[PDB]
Design a binder for this molecule. Sequence first.
Ligand SMILES: CN1CCN([C@H]2CC[C@@H](n3cc(-c4ccc(Oc5ccccc5)cc4)c4c(N)ncnc43)CC2)CC1
Length: 450
Amino acid sequence: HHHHIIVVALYDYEAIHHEDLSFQKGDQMVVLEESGEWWKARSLATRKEGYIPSNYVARVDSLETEEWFFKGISRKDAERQLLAPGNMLGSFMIRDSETTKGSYSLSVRDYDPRQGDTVKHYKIRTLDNGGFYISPRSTFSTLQELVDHYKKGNDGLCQKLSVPCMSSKPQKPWEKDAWEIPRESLKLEKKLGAGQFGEVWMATYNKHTKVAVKTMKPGSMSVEAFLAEANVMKTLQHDKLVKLHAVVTKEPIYIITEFMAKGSLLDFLKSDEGSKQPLPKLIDFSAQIAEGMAFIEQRNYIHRDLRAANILVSASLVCKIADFGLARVIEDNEYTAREGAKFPIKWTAPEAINFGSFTIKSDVWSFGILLMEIVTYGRIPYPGMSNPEVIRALERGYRMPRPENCPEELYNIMMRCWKNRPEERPTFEYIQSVLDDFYTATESQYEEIP
Ligand SMILES: CN1CCN([C@H]2CC[C@@H](n3cc(-c4ccc(Oc5ccccc5)cc4)c4c(N)ncnc43)CC2)CC1
């Protein structure tokens, strides 16, 4: 009923809107209301009221207040964060277990010549009368005691704990209730590119926030159809999908999203920087997209144009799916027809080309082609073949051969994605599983330390 949760700032926040409350790390507050990413709160110190970023604060009695506790992180994202540049041997984090509810997991950066950079996971068990342990000989009253113990010595661990995994201030939340925004709120600063049905620009919103704006050409979309689809796209909240912040519901329609500093995955892989990414990183890029596409599958949605051109890359090298569902709202009329085909033949499933049958299974086919794009660093699919040759070849059972530097398991995934019958193709859930655990035939999941 009432709101009795007291929170403390995990970072400083300077108000940029109207009803937002500014605060500094340590400042404690009372949550008066939970309105999503924004929470109405009261300063325990200066009595001031106002909205605060929910991701910048934590319950005062929580482990979320600790530098080494990572709340709401998956085993995979912990591995990716720990293996990120700027972390050292023994870098570590404690997180909520994904296998045993109420219990915790210790993730540590390790290095072996034969294995390379690795992340080892330890199960922190809870004691019934209070306390925690990884090995029965070593029990602790608190998790801080456990950390300090393993920071003094490995005591069975792969490495002595060094420093907490590095973290950065999270993204500031988009303004409360600013979905359909005025066009004058946006200053278009640099055109990033121009396509068949519109352009993309880097811009500033209300002088305070950098964003990307997809500007759709007049005649490309109905305002009402677009807004209905956009209201669904807004619900597709997942870390591997580009964040849609707002829209201008007047022709020319604008779609405002977070800015992704490294552009398209296609351009990145063809870049001097991306060409140097090792195969394990390429498989991780693939798994990131598979996680996003598994979410879209669980939500009964369809991308309709999956390809490296439609994957965006952050400065932190995180891949995020873009243009999910957009092809459904690009109308087929006299205006768009001049721009040429909406779908790239070499990425499109045969049933979609021949009958317009677009489903999650046609996305699976496209994901297979995207996997080949990634392992080939952006090479055109079906090298040496025109679009007409590809369609007739696919009808005769032709499939792209395994490229160099392509693990056979990855190629096998591609082949399954390219089954002619959509029902015989794998689920994104399966694809995500195989890719997330590609190098984990180690089994055990955790470490069995005595
Ligand atoms: C040769 N190159 C030249 C550069 N081209 C680039 C043109 C714009 C780039 N680009 C595009 C985007 C982008 C922006 C909005 C968008 O709209 C939707 C998002 C989700 C669901 C539905 C619609 C989709 C994509 C982008 C970005 N956010 N942040 C940073 N860069 C971004 C992506 C590639 C690509 C080809």
